[PDB]
Design a protein around this nucleic acid. Sequence first.
DNA 1: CCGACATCGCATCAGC
DNA 2: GCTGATGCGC
DNA 3: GTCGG
Length: 329
Amino acid sequence: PQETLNGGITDMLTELANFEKNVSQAIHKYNAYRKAASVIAKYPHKIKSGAEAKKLPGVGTKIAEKIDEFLATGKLRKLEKIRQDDTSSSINFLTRVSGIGPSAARKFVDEGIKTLEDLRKNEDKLNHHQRIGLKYFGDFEKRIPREEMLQMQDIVLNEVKKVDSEYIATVCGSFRRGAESSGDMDVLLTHPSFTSESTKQPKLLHQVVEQLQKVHFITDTLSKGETKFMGVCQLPSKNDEKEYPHRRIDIRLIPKDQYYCGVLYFTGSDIFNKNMRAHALEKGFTINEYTIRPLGVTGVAGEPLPVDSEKDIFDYIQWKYREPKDRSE
DNA sequence: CCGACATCGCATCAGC
DNA sequence: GCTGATGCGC
DNA sequence: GTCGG
Ligand code: NA
Ligand code: NA
């Protein structure tokens, strides 16, 4: 639905959401505001009163009240006062840098560091991760067009298979659901040799990251363990042509017997996972990001049910398989 | 009235 | 040195 | 902030 409808209200709730997250350090109020802004963005009617909105799930007395003030005046006093607020606006801004959460941003603004320029001058006060977020402050705020993601995908699948023909790599996320653009690339990886009660051969994941660094696809590392890599990557530029911006890429090494449970979860969407959790249980099963287990008559979950594909999970809960395209909810 | 709210691997801080 | 707590992005 | 036991 057109943003014009209640865009003024959704933006108001989102702005409030970021302040709770970055300044007040109130994550729950953050999600509360986002949930509200979200359900309000879906409502196919121009809201005329807070009471109308209050009907919607996620909108309570306070937000219905704020919505009223906004409709009557065109803005919100508490919000106007927050924007003109020196520290709060500096603190909010600083968190846009990957690596700087509410706490670091709170600390920088304290000692006088308020701008991207202040950070660029205090490089040794920033950890490895934060210097990379600074270095790509702009790039990290851009989105990734699908075609770009495909090019990016071709390279991941090609290099993984080059390291070992048994690796299985699946680019999940909104991408797998067919989305037109993305903010990042989440690649789930697995190898037959890696199972829940097996070895992690601390190189299955290393050998892959290392391979992607060799062909110069991965350009920076934010964090890397035996099962989770988080870094930056970039597509090869087409000779003397605006080189592609640096992109965020995560790689997960999951056990083969939990691999598909992993692919299901990271493909989502977030709504779709809730309908399955909800459904799965009524059918007598418990579904987490790792496994699917039967629930005895006393509520006692049993051993993890075997899974060799995504469909297997759907079959356990009396639900027909659904392509990642129809998993928007 | 008052607790839940989604999740967890990894880097790094705090403390012994 | 080590382990646990915290911060972070997801 | 919202929902709900
Ligand atoms: Na409501
Ligand atoms: Na940040």
